[PDB]
Design a protein around this nucleic acid. Structure first.
Lengths: 48, 56, 209
DNA sequence: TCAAGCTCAAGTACTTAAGCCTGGTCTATACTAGT
DNA sequence: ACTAGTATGAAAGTACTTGAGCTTGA
């Protein structure tokens, strides 16, 4: 529980430390999605 | 001797435009008045000075 | 070490025999793949100031047809070869009537001698190879497909069938290690047979530039 | 033994960083003749 | 004075050039 394992489910809901660690993982996913776009488009442009 | 435009027009320019100088930009934004939630969320907003489009 | 040196000299000997056979020369069948122990018996198991020293195993081979031309292979004693060392080999070649030769350098050539090798190219052709190039026959590697040098008649047949010019073929470097292996000059089309997972076999062609 | 030439390595400088679209706000200042 | 016109931290990589060192020749 200290290091980010969430033992609750979305039906029960998360405790605030698990909420914040879950928000960290989600922020990592959104950072991936927002940074991926320009580099992939530039690779497509160079290839074409 | 004391001309008033250099001390008032400069404040008015840096608040009206947001170009923070005569440097960086986007410091004074126009307030977002679509929702009272948007108005509150625009008054409680922090900007990291790190520039955009960074791969890190 | 001394066993490591006779192993290294035997592998260079093996790769030069396979290089001469793939280039189209008279290579004797037992010489083309001899045992390390056979090399140690024939030459003497002590490269450290002994019987299988350099210049003992300078391999002279002729061509499989037109047996006049030969590229009697050179092995310098010194690591770093120079001009006053290769002019002795030039003396040994001008004593003969044959124009191709291969030297197997240990360390890198002095670049003045690199320019010097080009400075007799219409007269008599000299290729050079480092020790690390000849500890592995790179044509045996699985990434390297079957390169075959084409005759000039087959090049005319190729360009006349596909109605294209030598400017239009996909090309290959002259300092390409497989091109250096076959010793092809500029303007000499190389057919390349490789297995394709969508047609079975694919023959491409590489003119040399 | 010295000088010259050639090659290699290191340092510095130059070019690019998604696609389309919708809104808004704002646009010089200092001076010096020239009355 | 004064007024309007006039005048000016948290890029990365590749390629080219310069300098230094080593080898050869005289």
């Amino acid at each position: 529980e200290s290091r980010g394992f969430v033992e609750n489910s979305y039906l029960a809901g998360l405790t605030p430390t698990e909420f914040f660690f879950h928000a960290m993982g989600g922020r990592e996913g959104l950072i991936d999605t927002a940074v991926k776009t320009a580099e992939t488009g530039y690779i497509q442009r160079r290839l074409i | 001797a004391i001309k008033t435009r250099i001390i008032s027009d400069g404040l008015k320019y840096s608040l009206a435009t947001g170009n923070w100088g005569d440097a960086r930009a986007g410091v004074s934004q126009v307030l977002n008045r679509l929702t009272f939630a948007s108005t509150l969320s625009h008054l409680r907003r922090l900007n990291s000075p790190i520039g955009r489009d960074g791969k890190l | 070490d001394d066993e490591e040196e006779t192993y290294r000299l035997w592998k260079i000997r093996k790769t030069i025999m396979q290089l001469c056979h793939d280039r189209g020369y008279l290579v004797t069948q037992d010489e083309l793949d001899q045992t390390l122990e056979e090399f140690k018996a024939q030459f003497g198991d002590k490269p450290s100031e002994g019987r299988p020293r350099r210049t003992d195993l300078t391999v002279l081979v002729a061509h499989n047809d037109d047996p006049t031309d030969q590229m009697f292979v050179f092995f310098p004693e010194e690591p770093k070869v120079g001009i006053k060392t290769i002019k002795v080999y030039c003396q040994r070649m001008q004593e003969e009537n044959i124009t191709r030769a291969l030297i197997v350098v240990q360390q890198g050539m002095t670049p003045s001698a690199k320019q010097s090798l080009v400075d007799m190219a219409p007269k008599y052709i000299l290729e050079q190879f480092l020790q690390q190039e000849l500890l592995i026959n790179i044509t045996e590697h699985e990434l390297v497909p079957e390169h075959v040098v084409m005759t000039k008649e087959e090049v005319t047949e190729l360009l006349a069938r596909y109605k294209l010019r030598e400017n239009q073929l996909p090309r290959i470097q002259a300092g390409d290690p497989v091109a250096r292996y076959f010793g092809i000059k500029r303007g000499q089309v190389v057919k390349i047979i490789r297995p394709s997972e969508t047609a079975g076999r694919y023959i491409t062609y590489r003119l040399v530039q």
